[PDB]
Design a protein around this ligand. Structure first.
Ligand SMILES: COc1c(Cl)cccc1Nc1c(-c2ccncc2OC[C@@H]2CCCO2)[nH]c2c1C(=O)NCC2
Ligand SMILES: [Cl-]
Length: 302
């Protein structure tokens, strides 16, 4: 039962742009609800050139609100202004793609493998709620703290019926370099096509934000995949980590790993992280943590 909370425009203060792009425009702000009188850091999303498109996103997010998973973004409510806006808790450390690019010199094995676990736990939750994301990528993972990441952006997400195993898409722009072959060829999307995208997302993290198939046009991808070519082994990845990615990119969808399997294997690896990822100076690296006495420094800076 999907309940949309409508937030008053007048309850938001110090609204400022964070960034723009394919996702539209995201702002940060302080939501002070009347009565409670407490300042809650919030992110605000809108499109600028339909109000329909963003309500579909709010529906899907409202539809999977029954259970609180810590690794998927919660809709706090919408706001009606000049445009329709989505509202969520601010993820202060921002987008994981940008984060791995900027903090490369202090990202150790433990962090990369833990992130992989947390994204698999988030997708497993969404699979249980019959949700196909259709846009899993580093750009659609956010950082609450360097130890804690959440899946976001349900603009392409589809809920499957009790009977339905797959969603057939119509003519609509889609991220080719993150999509399974059968999605490129036949516009078919399943939980197992999301596993392919999970594979690409992991490659992005292990390369500290490299562009997949860089300098290759989107029209050559299906032919490259049909020849048996895949994204290369990242320098830091031992064979077991790369084999997981290659299992995610298998032609037979049902042969690909399940998220429940990916949780367990990446969990096993997180218990001995230096065995599975080889990073120079791993033990000398550090990122801010809530347990740190001076963590309030990082939150205010970022
Ligand atoms: C769908 O969940 C949201 C809602 Cl309901 C409201 C506002 C933002 C989001 N999520 C997103 C954030 C976001 C959510 C929370 N806190 C900070 C955020 O942005 C951080 C940086 C700024 C611009 C790129 O990401 N950033 C992005 C989305 C998104 O949906 N697609 C890609 C970029
Ligand atoms: Cl693309």
């Amino acid at each position: 039962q999907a309940l949309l909370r409508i937030l008053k425009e007048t309850e938001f203060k110090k609204i400022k742009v964070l960034g723009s792009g394919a996702f539209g425009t995201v702002y940060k702000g302080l939501w002070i609800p009347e009565g409670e009188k407490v300042k809650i850091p919030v992110a605000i999303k809108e499109l600028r050139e339909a109000n329909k498109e963003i309500l579909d996103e709010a529906y899907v997010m409202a539809s999977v609100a029954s259970v609180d998973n810590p690794h998927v973004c919660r809709l706090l409510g919408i706001c009606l202004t000049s445009t329709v806006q989505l509202i969520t808790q601010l993820m202060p450390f921002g987008c994981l793609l940008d984060y791995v690019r900027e903090h490369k010199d202090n990202i150790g094995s433990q962090y990369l493998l833990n992130w992989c676990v947390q994204i698999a736990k988030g997708m497993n939750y969404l699979e249980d709620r019959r949700l196909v994301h259709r846009d899993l990528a580093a750009r659609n993972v956010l950082v609450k703290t360097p130890q804690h990441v959440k899946i976001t952006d349900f603009g392409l997400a589809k809920l499957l019926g009790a009977e339905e195993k797959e969603y057939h898409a119509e003519g609509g722009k889609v991220p080719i370099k993150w999509m399974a072959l059968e999605s490129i060829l036949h516009r078919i999307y399943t939980h197992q096509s999301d596993v392919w995208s999970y594979g690409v997302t992991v490659w992005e993290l292990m390369t500290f934000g490299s562009k997949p198939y860089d300098g290759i046009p989107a029209s050559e991808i299906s032919s490259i995949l049909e020849k048996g070519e895949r994204l290369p082994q990242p320098p830091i990845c031992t064979i077991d980590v790369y084999m997981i990615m290659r299992k995610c990119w298998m032609i037979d969808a049902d042969s690909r790993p399940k998220f429940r399997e990916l949780i367990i294997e990446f969990s096993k690896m997180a218990r001995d992280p230096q065995r599975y990822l080889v990073i120079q100076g791993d033990e000398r690296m550090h990122l801010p943590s809530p347990t740190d006495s001076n963590f309030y420094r990082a939150l205010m800076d970022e």
